[PDB]
Design a protein around this ligand. Structure first.
Ligand SMILES: *[C@@H]1O[C@H](CO)[C@@H](O)[C@H](O)[C@H]1NC(C)=O
Ligand SMILES: *[C@@H]1O[C@H](CO)[C@@H](O)[C@H](O)[C@H]1NC(C)=O
Ligand SMILES: *[C@@H]1O[C@H](CO)[C@@H](O)[C@H](O)[C@H]1NC(C)=O
Ligand SMILES: *[C@@H]1O[C@H](CO)[C@@H](O)[C@H](O)[C@H]1NC(C)=O
Ligand SMILES: *[C@@H]1O[C@H](CO)[C@@H](O)[C@H](O)[C@H]1NC(C)=O
Ligand SMILES: *[C@@H]1O[C@H](CO)[C@@H](O)[C@H](O)[C@H]1NC(C)=O
Ligand SMILES: [Zn+2]
Ligand SMILES: [Zn+2]
Ligand SMILES: [Zn+2]
Ligand SMILES: [Zn+2]
Ligand SMILES: [Zn+2]
Ligand SMILES: [Zn+2]
Ligand SMILES: [Zn+2]
Ligand SMILES: [Zn+2]
Ligand SMILES: [Zn+2]
Lengths: 446, 446, 446
């Protein structure tokens, strides 16, 4: 937490146009509140002059998350299946004795559920044998039955709309020996406490240097209320789905699309049943087995999934990993202000960077730091690397004197050839002066 | 409008490196100007000491809009149509007497406009009858003619580039009994008034908590210069279009794509003519008939379409529904400053929330508020709901003492089952203290 | 550079909970640092009172760029080619004497590399002649061989992740006649200089009015380590690629997709080989030949490609053309502060606007300006146009007294018909007062 400005201003309240206005001199403060503040790192003490204990203010800010406004579209099956039935005489208006596993649903009769009969032999959809003339003359002409059924798991298809940034700002005030809590957020961004002495107003946020995804042209697939919890949750492009169920080889095929097919008995098996949810889940599994980031699945690429307050099953939100400075304005009924901050030295314990692939993989530099002081203090950490590795953002954090904090950085090299780099981790305190420096051996595999 | 800081600073102008510099002490102010301010809610009076009426400043800000830089690509038809002609002898180089409605355009001859002849009978593109041998021996062999024509409406295809935020900031100055207007925006963000006494500079905007769409991978279709005005205006994905006219079943098909088709007489009717503008318009109509938000059409999902100044037919902009705090800096040639704000009580008249579907629909809470005071004053409104409903952003507005304002909130429940919730609307004044509280019965349909 | 606030604040450092805290009164400054500042335009002189040369501070800021976190997916060929071989007896397990250019790769044997034999004559994939019965009775039955090979150039397919904003802020301090440099950026945003006298902290950025692309659903194709340097670099939609190599007519086709084709000998030539990298490169060439902006190619639409520090071949970044105000906080160990800015008059030399097409093209207004003064000073430029042309953002720049600067504006008309417009260019100094006005004749072609 850093004070942007301290200023004295005479605020005058007006109630009637004809009547007289009453004034009151207040002390307006502009604050930059970063995400992760607790209050135990810095305090703002107010000095009041009357014409006995001074009021102390401590500001706490929670981690940020991005909530996405979901709109329900239509239910979709996980694995649509095509069944082959090698029998004798075939007809779409047949019984289970000659169609076996195919059949037809009567939930009443459905003309699109009935199977399609194709001739026997090779070059056809299903390769079979026509048999002999004498077996054909009694049992009937050999035919293959093809049907579309939807067994197994089902998924919800949601449309990602606007993205909403959410958090909570706790303002603690000590008039004497008694505490008063003020909760400020995007939902409730204006508050007053203890007989109009305090005025907390949330103006906005100071622009970050890392983007938050919008997921504009994507749909979210949620399993109906094997693999991990959010690994089944996928973000797939809108063009990949067939909401009308009239398009082939797209997520959400219908019976009408499959039955109305160009050259059904000539086209290969499993046609009109390609690029489904199982194909996209399997492509992630193959990528995860090779120890790489998934392309569609949520788990692995996003941090803190659905860990937001007032959560639900049909709700989607991702954690904002970047530290954001939130512009807060505290307007006090005092004469002046004193800013009391806490400082405590710290040391870098050990940096753990594992060996990773040339460009298919990225680096993770786990840096654990201990507070060697006696009081809870603010900290800064810069992770500088060689010409090959791209710049990494500075990390802000508050460590208790009896605790440790693990801080990881994503390392991105620009070279293809297996090269050796050197990284220097610089730790700073509430005072922007360096407390400890550390080096680490870094190398990639071709 | 809220004052971030008030500060005295000695500004010194330099003209020559060798020469002497002249100083002047000025009073710099940092302001957070929200969208919707008029000036009648708060005033900033300057106190000048010389070695008679004080100058009063009032700042007005307009509602925000997002303008999209459109680039013309190519014209596209609304409904491309395939015509069937059941005749006798067929040939692509035939006359209108034996091709009827098909024919060919001579705007000169066009080899891609001529129809394609297919054999008679079933299993073909068009189901017909071959007739008898004796009718065939005189009139000719029976054939079906198929042709591609483009009748009806046409549309413009534009590429959405960068998004530009636009608004206007009016700065009113009263030196005596005479007014002076200063218009500040992203186009003109630096101004000075009345012999260098005033200095208005627009630094930037304070980060909002709601996203504005970019429409990156989308194209805008505009009808050529039934349905509503902007309901015909659609935002469709770039992959859905065939700008080259060589791809089948994509928006903007050509004659070449249709003529060069795999197994033309074997493939079903209306092939190469799927997923066109009419299919996307019809899918919106079906969604609107079921009282749900459209997927492609502009009207229904976006507020204030093309209501921006300096508008045109080949221009696109959407209104920014979220209130944005604009960072303005007023630098005055005075000794000090007095901030005179207006306060007027208000009461919640009635909350109107209609019953809506489980997840296919969202809620709208119409809250009408009256200014019970005597002067124009600023207001705040928080709409808190149960654990199931997600957080809604705080609304800022200015109400005249002889007027009312309707304020609607979008309600998003997280549960699928028909549940009953309770919502509490809290109204605040220019003073962040609550003026009126109101409750409402809330329930959804399964 | 503009001072947002100047404030005196007593900062008190705490080391132990039981122990006593030491105070120090500091002078906190809030600054809006725009991109392009050098230091020679304005200086901030500090006045220190002790109980001899004053410290002078000059702040320089570099131009901004947006860096995209690339993740490697798979290699892709530029032009996959299908070869036709008109021979006699054909078989997939044949020798080079009867398959000619087709053959098969043995890098060992590959069952998917072997060609496919199709019957002779018309209506087939390749139109040929079956010859005579007597030529067939000795040489063999006539057949056509079809094979898929990947000759020529190859490309890298990268997944665009998060966007990171990068720049550098230089803080120059003169204690006496000796200089001290402080480099502040998103990587290192906290610094202290000359025995805790200076405290530079980077809070964030002030919201711009122009968007920066995210490229969410796009992939970047880079040629393997004719056309320009970055013209071969393309941004193509994720749906356009077939990473699995199982889909036809999509970027990155495999042998399996081509061999497993519906009615191979019936379908037209070059099938399963459509919509490849060469098709997208050619569509840009045709657009560039007609003097229009490319759709996929990087060069032409984006400014300053890969001109960022710590660059590489597998790195992607675009220059931020919009001027951004960066919120910097300088906290000094002094009693007061004096702001000394430089002012120098300037004149508009000549405006060069070429005649362009109705809506397929956009305008470029090259405005060259000279500093007629004696010292390096800040400048402002507004380019107002008629009702038809949309609003253009104000441009900030610093010109040396012995130099000139060319400033171009993108002009977007809203009318389709060839109309004549009038544009007024207004130049301003460090003082927001107008120095020079200029008009220009403007017209478009239908
Ligand atoms: C902020 O306060 C909440 C309780 O209201 C607490 O759970 C949270 O841990 C505090 N923040 C920090 C960073 O300690
Ligand atoms: C703001 O409103 C929310 C929701 O009603 C509530 O939880 C919070 O405590 C409120 N803040 C204050 C300071 O009362
Ligand atoms: C701001 O001023 C314009 C006239 O310049 C006026 O039309 C507008 O209504 C004013 N804004 C408000 C919120 O009253
Ligand atoms: C800023 O420029 C625009 C366009 O020329 C104009 O409408 C506006 O009045 C200008 N503002 C001032 C303060 O002159
Ligand atoms: C800022 O300083 C660097 C050297 O550190 C210099 O190259 C650059 O030109 C300076 N910026 C400007 C706008 O002059
Ligand atoms: C900040 O860190 C970077 C990388 O180590 C370095 O180049 C820069 O000079 C540092 N800034 C200061 C003020 O030391
Ligand atoms: Zn038998
Ligand atoms: Zn569910
Ligand atoms: Zn498949
Ligand atoms: Zn007859
Ligand atoms: Zn038009
Ligand atoms: Zn259709
Ligand atoms: Zn011969
Ligand atoms: Zn390479
Ligand atoms: Zn092609």
């Amino acid at each position: 937490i850093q004070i942007l400005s301290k200023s004295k201003l005479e605020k005058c309240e007006k109630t009637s146009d004809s009547g007289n206005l009453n004034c009151s001199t207040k002390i307006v403060l502009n604050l930059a509140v970063p995400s992760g503040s607790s209050g135990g790192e810095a305090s703002i003490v107010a000095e009041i002059v009357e014409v006995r204990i001074p009021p102390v203010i401590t500001v706490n800010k929670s981690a940020a998350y991005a909530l996405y406004d979901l709109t329900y579209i239509r239910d979709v099956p996980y694995k649509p299946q095509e069944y082959h039935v090698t029998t004798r005489k075939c007809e779409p208006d047949a019984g289970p004795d000659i169609v076996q596993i195919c059949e037809r649903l009567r939930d009443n009769v459905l003309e699109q559920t009935q199977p399609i009969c194709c001739p026997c032999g090779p070059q056809r959809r299903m390769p079979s044998s026509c048999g002999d003339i004498f077996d054909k003359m009694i049992k009937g002409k050999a035919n293959t039955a093809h049907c579309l059924r939807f067994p197994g798991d089902w998924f919800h298809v949601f449309g990602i709309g606007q993205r909403s940034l959410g958090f909570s700002v706790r303002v603690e005030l000590k008039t004497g020996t008694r505490v008063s809590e003020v909760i400020i957020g995007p939902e409730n961004r204006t508050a007053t406490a203890n007989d109009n002495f305090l005025k907390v107003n949330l103006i906005g946020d100071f622009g970050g240097y890392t983007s938050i995804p919008s997921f504009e042209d994507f749909y979210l697939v949620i399993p109906r209320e094997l693999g991990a919890n959010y690994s089944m949750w996928m973000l797939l492009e809108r063009v990949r789905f067939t909401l009308d169920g009239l398009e082939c080889n797209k997520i959400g095929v219908g019976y009408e699309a499959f039955n109305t097919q160009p050259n059904f008995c000539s086209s290969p098996y499993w046609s009109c049943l390609h690029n489904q949810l199982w194909n996209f889940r399997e492509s992630d599994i193959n990528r995860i087995d090779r120890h790489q980031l998934p392309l569609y699945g949520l788990e692995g690429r996003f941090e803190r999934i659905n860990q937001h307050p007032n959560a639900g099953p049909h709700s989607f939100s991702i954690g904002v990993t970047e530290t954001l400075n939130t512009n807060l304005m505290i307007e006090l009924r005092a004469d002046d202000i004193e800013y009391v901050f806490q400082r405590s030295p710290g040391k870098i314990i050990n940096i753990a960077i594992p060996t990773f692939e040339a460009l298919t993989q990225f680096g993770v530099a786990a840096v654990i730091i201990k507070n060697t002081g006696e009081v809870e203090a603010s900290y800064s950490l810069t992770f500088d690397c060689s010409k090959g590795v791209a710049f990494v953002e500075e990390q802000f954090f508050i460590i208790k004197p009896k605790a440790v904090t693990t801080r990881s950085f994503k390392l991105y090299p620009t070279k293809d050839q297996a090269a050796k780099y050197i990284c220097t981790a610089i730790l700073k305190d509430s005072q922007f002066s360096e407390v400890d420096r550390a080096e680490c051996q870094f190398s990639t595999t071709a």
